[PDB]
Design a protein around this ligand. Structure first.
Ligand code: NA
Ligand code: NA
Lengths: 105, 105
């Protein structure tokens, strides 16, 4: 089923309104994290102790706390070519842009 | 309204069955993170670039990606007295247990 995992998400810079300064790429594979954090929390989702205990509290009481959340736990940079006061400029490592790993938190 | 923040959450170890191996304390203030991540994402929620972009894509297209999630971004230890493979063990800082900061991710 839809257990927590990384899934595809292509973002075109026109959607976010950044085509005003970004020249290239026109968009990028950003990925996203979707799905449920189900007990027992799988090791590959690197759950914290708090996420484990919150999940267990909620498992037997759905009106107390809530499920752990599927979120990015590791992000990767991309390169962007952009306009810096009208001068074409390249940043090789624009950090925090694409998901490489997901986890329950 | 219900913006992402830290909220109280007391966890009695009995209610999760961890009293089988945790001798003391009987429970602790674990806290939890609750609420929505609304654009513009407030700076105190330390949003990543991915969280900002995902939120913006979702803002004008509710059927693409999703909202960023309110999760713990800093966890604190507690002291516990417990049984480890059948011997009473003391650990002054059992890490990852109590929320001290929340953020949007
Ligand atoms: Na792909
Ligand atoms: Na697109």
């Amino acid at each position: 089923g839809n257990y927590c995992k990384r899934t595809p998400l292509y973002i075109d810079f026109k959607e976010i309104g950044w085509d005003s300064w970004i020249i290239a790429p026109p968009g990028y594979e950003a990925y996203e994290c979707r799905g449920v954090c189900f007990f027992p929390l799988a090791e590959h989702l690197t759950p914290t102790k708090h996420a484990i205990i919150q999940t267990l509290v909620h498992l037997k009481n759905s009106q107390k706390a809530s499920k752990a959340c599927c979120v990015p736990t590791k992000l990767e940079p991309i390169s962007i070519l952009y306009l810096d006061k009208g001068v074409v400029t390249l940043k090789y490592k624009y950090e925090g842009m694409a998901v490489s790993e997901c986890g329950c938190r």
